[PDB]
Paper text:
As do other ATP synthases in eubacteria, chloroplasts, and mitochondria, the enzyme couples a proton-motive force (pmf) across the IPM generated by respiration to the synthesis in the F1-domain of the enzyme of ATP from adenosine diphosphate (ADP) and phosphate by a mechanical rotary mechanism.
Extensive classification of the data for the mycobacterial ATP synthase revealed the presence of not only the three main states referred to as S1, S2, and S3 but also of substates within them. Substates S1a to S1e are in S1, and S3a to S3c are in S3. In S2 (where there are no resolved substates) the c-ring has traveled two c-monomers further round (ca.120°), and in state 3 substates S3a to S3c have all traveled on to approximately the same position, four c-monomers (or ca. 280°) further on. Again, the position of the PS suggests that the order of substates is either S3c > S3a > S3b or S3b > S3a > S3c. However, alignment of the substates via the “crown” in the F1-domain shows that they have identical nucleotide occupancies and that the position of the γ-subunit is also maintained. Alignment of the substates via the a-subunit demonstrates that the c9-rings and the membrane α-helices of the a-, b-, and bδ-subunits of the substates are in identical positions, as are the ε-subunits, and in some instances the lower part of the γ-subunit.
Author numbering:
A (entry chain a): 10 to 247
B (entry chain M), J (entry chain R), L (entry chain S), M (entry chain T): 2 to 86
C (entry chain b): 23 to 60
D (entry chain H): 3 to 120
E (entry chain d): 1 to 50
F (entry chain N), G (entry chain O), H (entry chain P), I (entry chain Q), K (entry chain L): 3 to 86
The structure:
């Protein structure tokens, strides 16, 4: 079997259910990100030779700044740079940590992952996507006031396509979330399926799929961050 | 003596499967074609990216609108199956 | 059912938020300053 | 490598081997390498030609009234006029650019693109 | 349990392919960036001295 | 089992086919027309205003077909013809 | 089972197939013709008048087949052949 | 249940497949031929008469396929072979 | 139930698939070949006669598959294998 | 209550119908594309007709092959149905 | 007959349609986007880095539909809606 | 009665039909497109054939391998049917 | 009276057949289109063969990945059918 949709360490608080495994994975990713951030803050070298951590962080910042400048001037969207970079690093680390060999036997022949990519959980992707949705809608309201922005989004670039435009504002968040979830959820199944093979043959397809999943996770992080920057750019114009 | 609701909901599941199959085919291929246009324009005219992202996104909007209308109707089919007793 | 949301949502959001804050207060500003100085 | 030859109406300006030739035609930007297929194209009003040569800096030439011809062996650029990067004075091209006449404006923009400011 | 050994072997293969093909180019890019920034600083010092 | 169940299942499958075809057609046609428009604007930026006019004609035909299909789906699923 | 139930389910499925095929054909054909029209307009704006002539001929050849498909679906669903 | 019921349901589904395939083929082929014609007219305004004949041959072929399909579907639906 | 009824329904659906696929393939292939011929004639008017030979080869290749499908559908429907 | 071979042969007939549908779609469209390439090449270079037929024949072979293997396997499905107990 | 049996059979067929359509769309869309990227690079090789970004935007937009369909297929197959 | 194995065989035959139909469509279209590219390239350049066969062979292999994988799995479906009791 | 397991596995085989059909179509079409682009590039500019093989292989990865995901989910459908009783 595959036990799709199973969650471990599930608990209850304030009359609400929480998936302990996904919370743990998110906390681990956040800890890694914070550790890298503090490593950078310690090893900043304005005049000295930058360290690998500084090079990585500055590469991310440079790419995101270039994207924003191409879309909308930094002077108009300064916060979008930190938002996009944190989104990108969060998703990238979440996807990449799955490569580590945390898969074992479930005592019934069904594989169990000690660490599972949080993006495979609908709550994680929904949190990210809805936060971004609220963020750039608030930014658009701020640019075009509390009233002007709704008319602009409804009318879009051509007014007479107002209905379709409405659908767009519904499609942007959903497409932002589900996509990511899918691309990670699929992984959570592939490895599981590969686990059905005997070890002496299970090793190889697992290696191939995980090696490809590394690039898939990098691509997904890049796409999600780029589309976030892009939706911000759309929401803040005129 | 099959449960009428059982037949109805199985038919609804097959119908929604068709809805999303068609929607995904259309959306994927239309987005791919619009992207072909976009990358071609960027390669030929590097400075035209800003003036191209608008029409490309309008056409992508129409393409995605079709797909997500299909999404809404598939959700109606499976969760609020019309005609189900 | 795995597609349904949960309380985890809020928790995840909170975690993301704090990370964002850190990145906005101890990573992006110093890095942008370093690039500007360079 | 490919034999670049920048040929003006009055005199063959430049010649010699090169590894890459970047330019901008009416269809769009184009890059030419040793065995590029035979080609005939028209350079844009404010075209610029970048020539990357074996172990040398890129030769940036502003071109006015340009035509590109890629042969089985050689790449020839026929220019009504052309100017190597070193010979452009910034202020003159700046003032000529954003003018009324189209020829002078295009020539100034080509000079600017050669300079490296765009 | 057997799947555990299988995925350990898979991860060993992943680590080998990484360290053998991905590490060299990324390390070279890192060294190129470090050398470029070091050269920029050296040029700044030389220009100030000049 | 009552015949109404079979008729409703058939209607649902028919509507599924209707909207699958409609979405395929709409997506492909809109993508192709948008590709043409992007290529046109990729060369002559000022051409955008005059290009919108035929582009919207194409989009109207495509979406006209799609929405006819939608109307027939609504007829199939909500008021199923022949529903005994 | 009521035979008319089977007949109506089959008729609904067939009509759905008819409309799905017609939708795909109409949408994609209109998209391709509109792509041609858009490219032609982009290359030379003045040509619009002469371009709209063959474009309408193509649109007719496509939409006529689509509407024939629609009519045959209408036959299938409302007045089902061999309804019995 | 009447065997003729199953026969007629199968015939209706088959005819729907016939019409869907014919619709898709006719729409795509006519759209492509019209794209060729429109591009030719755009490039050469005076080539209308020269191009009509090739375009008509292409149409003729596509529409012949469509009409053969329609005839076979009519045979399927109104004169179902194997009916009993 | 009568086995012949199930067999005939299956054969009718199969033949409908035969001809639907044949229709799609023939229509699209003929459209593409006609597009090529129209473009060639527009570019090179004098080659109008010369181009038909490869065009006839292409159309023959497409119609070969189409009519093979037609014959096999006739086999499926009129003389259904496995009837019993 | 019905003959198992009856439903088995019905399924085999539907399967073979799919075999031919896919084979015909692929063959027709691929041959159309290859012929379009051949026509464009002949129009562009009149004297290349002698040399173009080689790659054209290779492509047509690669397409009609797939088609005829599909035909053979449909014949297997119908005339000698696997698992026709 | 067990209702859940027919429910799950219908759900499996539905999910098969879901992800088959998704796979077709993703394959063709990635093929087309990669074709555009490869042609652009072949024109000007050092446009490679400049072109990956729109290429990945297009790849994301295409894969969106495919992976949304994959998620809904997982819902269909693993948590079947309306499964008595 | 409706012998279970008969239903299994019918489903397997239809599944093999679908597998082969999709495989044939993919193979035919892909080979046709690759051959179109090859024919155009050879038409432009006489001697290009020698170097063009290499990428053309790569594409043909990548497409035909996908088709033959479907072939093998159809053979699995109709000869060793999974889940058959 | 039908064995529910037989219905489940018949539906599973149909679904797997659809999955393979769609995946094969997608992989074939995408690989053919990418190979057409590669052949056109090699014909136009042979010296950029190495530079072109990179985006070509990226596209082939992005296509074959979806294809093999379809393969894995189909193997799930047929060999370990979800919902099997």
């Amino acid at each position: 079997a595959i036990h799709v949709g199973h969650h471990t360490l599930v608990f209850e608080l304030f009359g609400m259910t929480f998936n302990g495994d996904t919370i743990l994975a998110t906390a681990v990713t956040a800890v890694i990100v914070i550790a890298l951030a503090f490593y950078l803050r310690a090893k900043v070298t304005s005049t000295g030779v930058p360290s690998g951590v500084q090079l990585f962080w500055e590469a991310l910042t440079i790419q995101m700044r270039q994207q924003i400048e191409g879309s909308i001037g930094m002077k108009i969207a300064p916060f979008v740079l930190p938002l996009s970079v944190t989104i990108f690093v969060f998703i990238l680390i979440s996807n990449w940590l799955a490569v580590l060999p945390l898969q074992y036997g479930g005592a019934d022949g069904a594989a169990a992952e000690l660490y599972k990519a949080p993006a495979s959980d609908i709550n994680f992707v929904l949190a990210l996507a809805l936060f971004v949705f609220v963020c750039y809608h608030a930014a658009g309201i701020w640019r075009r006031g509390i009233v002007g922005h709704p008319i602009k989004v409804v009318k879009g670039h051509v007014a007479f396509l107002a209905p379709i435009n409405i659908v767009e504002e519904l499609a942007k968040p959903i497409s932002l979330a589900l996509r990511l979830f899918g691309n990670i959820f699929a992984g959570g199944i592939l490895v599981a399926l590969i686990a059905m093979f005997p070890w002496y043959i299970q090793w190889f397809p697992n290696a191939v799929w995980k090696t490809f999943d590394l690039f898939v996770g990098l691509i997904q992080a890049f796409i999600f961050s780029l589309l976030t920057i892009l939706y911000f750019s759309q929401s803040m114009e005129l | 003596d099959l449960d009428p609701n059982a037949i109805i909901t199985a038919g609804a599941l097959i119908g929604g499967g068709l809805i999303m199959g068609g929607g995904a085919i259309g959306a994927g291929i239309g987005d791919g074609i619009a992207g072909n246009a976009l990358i071609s324009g960027i390669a030929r005219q590097p400075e035209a990216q800003g003036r191209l992202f608008t029409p490309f996104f309008i056409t992508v909007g129409l393409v995605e609108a079709a797909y997500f209308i299909n999404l809404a109707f598939m959700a109606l089919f499976v969760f609020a199956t019309p005609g189900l007793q | 059912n795995f597609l349904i949301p949960n309380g985890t949502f809020f928790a995840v959001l909170i975690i993301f938020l704090i990370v964002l804050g850190v990145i906005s207060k101890w990573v992006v500003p110093p890095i942008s300053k370093v690039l500007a100085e360079r | 490598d490919l034999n670049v030859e920048i040929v003006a109406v009055e005199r063959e300006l430049w010649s010699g081997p090169a590894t890459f030739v970047f330019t901008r035609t009416t269809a769009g930007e184009i890059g030419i390498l040793p065995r590029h297929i035979p080609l005939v194209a028209q350079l844009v009003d404010d075209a610029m030609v970048r020539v990357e040569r074996e172990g040398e800096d890129d030769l940036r030439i502003a071109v006015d009234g340009g035509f590109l011809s890629v042969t089985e062996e050689t790449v020839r650029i026929l220019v009504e006029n052309a100017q190597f990067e070193s010979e452009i004075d910034a202020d003159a091209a700046k003032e000529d650019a954003a003018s009324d006449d189209e020829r002078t404006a295009a020539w100034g923009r080509a000079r600017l693109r050669a300079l490296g400011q765009i | 349990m057997s799947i555990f050994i299988g995925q350990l072997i898979g991860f060993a293969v992943i680590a080998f392919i990484i360290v053998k093909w991905v590490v060299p180019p990324v390390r070279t890019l890192m060294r190129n960036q470090q050398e470029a920034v070091r050269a920029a600083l050296a040029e700044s010092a030389e220009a100030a001295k000049k």
